[PDB]
Amino acid sequence: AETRIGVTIYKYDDNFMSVVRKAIEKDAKASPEITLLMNDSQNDQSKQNDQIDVLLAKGVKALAINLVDPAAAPVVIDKARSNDIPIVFYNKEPSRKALDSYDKAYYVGTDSKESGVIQGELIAKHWQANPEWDLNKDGKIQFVLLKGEPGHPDAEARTTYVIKTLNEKGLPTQQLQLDTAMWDTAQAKDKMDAWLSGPNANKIEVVIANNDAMAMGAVEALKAHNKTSVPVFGVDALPEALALVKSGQMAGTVLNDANNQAKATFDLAKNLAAGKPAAEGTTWKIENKIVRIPYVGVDKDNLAEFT
Ligand SMILES: OC[C@H]1O[C@@H](O)[C@H](O)[C@@H](O)[C@@H]1O
Numbered sequence: 195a196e197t198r199i200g201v202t203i204y205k206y207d208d209n210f211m212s213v214v215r216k217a218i219e220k221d222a223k224a225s226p227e228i229t230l231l232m233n234d235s236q237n238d239q240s241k242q243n244d245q246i247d248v249l250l251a252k253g254v255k256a257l258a259i260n261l262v263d264p265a266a267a268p269v270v271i272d273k274a275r276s277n278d279i280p281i282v283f284y285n286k287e288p289s290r291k292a293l294d295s296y297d298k299a300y301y302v303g304t305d306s307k308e309s310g311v312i313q314g315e316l317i318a319k320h321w322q323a324n325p326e327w328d329l330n331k332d333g334k335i336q337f338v339l340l341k342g343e344p345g346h347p348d349a350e351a352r353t354t355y356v357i358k359t360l361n362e363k364g365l366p367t368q369q370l371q372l373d374t375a376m377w378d379t380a381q382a383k384d385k386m387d388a389w390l391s392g393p394n395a396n397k398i399e400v401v402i403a404n405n406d407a408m409a410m411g412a413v414e415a416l417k418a419h420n421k422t423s424v425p426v427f428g429v430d431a432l433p434e435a436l437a438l439v440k441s442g443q444m445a446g447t448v449l450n451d452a453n454n455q456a457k458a459t460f461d462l463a464k465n466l467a468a469g470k471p472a473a474e475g476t477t478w479k480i481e482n483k484i485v486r487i488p489y490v491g492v493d494k495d496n497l498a499e500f501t
């Protein structure tokens with residue numbers, strides 16, 4: 195006996211979604227009647243759309259979709275609803291209007307703003323404890339920021355709220371550079387290397403990255419330029435970032451809870467595949483069809499909890 199569930203990951207080479215992918219597959223092992231059909235959309239929404247057509251033709255009873263493009267949620271909804279197939283969107287949040295457009299569309303993710311606020315609180319905490327970080331002694335944080343994908347809710351909120359949080363805590367900032375590296379380590383290394391080769395190089399006091407993968411690239415570029423005392427902040431708490439916090443090569447990150455997002459996505463998909471209320475028999479709190487899993491700030495104080 196078997197219930198098929200189709201799953202997409204927007205790109206398997208995304209560091210964070212690779213963690214989520216493995217956690218989904220691990221959780222599915224405990225429900226041997228489920229057969230997961232797991233797909234790498236390779237960062238291409240048209241490929242994902244074709245994959246969804248195949249999954250529906252192969253008789254999946256639910257879809258768990260990590261969109262390539264958040265704006266494509268209506269296309270996916272239109273495909274799934276033809277035969278009343280439920281969708282748990284996850285990690286890339288569709289619009290409220292898209293979620294409300296189909297009774298069987300749900301979302302599992304995070305409060306994106308919370309991660310920006312926590313990151314700003316972490317930067318404030320360390321800035322206030324490290325007066326030497328104010329290289330030009332002007333009382334302002336001269337920073338560069340590595341942004342995630344334009345329009346991605348986590349990139350937009352982390353970028354807006356890290357700065358609002360710092361400023362509201364009484365720490366003025368000066369944005370020397372702000373550009374996207376598309377969540378990617380190599381793009382971030384190249385972008386940081388360019389900034390370190392230009393006129394703002396010696397003015398940079400803090401590196402803020404919307405994720406750990408981009409922070410890791412910035413760390414490499416800082417090392418190449420012998421700027422290892424410029425602090426770097428990320429988001430996700432990837433193992434590699436936790437190792438950099440331990441060595442002092444990153445100042446802080448924020449746990450993006452892949453384990454519980456994967457478990458909630460799988461649990462909701464499994465209930466919906468059976469025609470049951472989405473959170474039945476689970477602890478997940480659905481609020482207007484959305485589950486949000488808390489972020490947690492991580493630095494040297496609480497690092498031992500995570501390694
Ligand atoms: O959608 C993918 C993105 O999701 C974000 O929540 C993670 O912080 C990023 O690392 C990841 O690249």
Ligand SMILES: [Ca+2]
Pocket residue numbers: 328329330331332333334335336399
């Ligand atoms: Ca300064």
Ligand code: NA
Pocket residue numbers: 212213214215216217452
């Ligand atoms: Na994992």
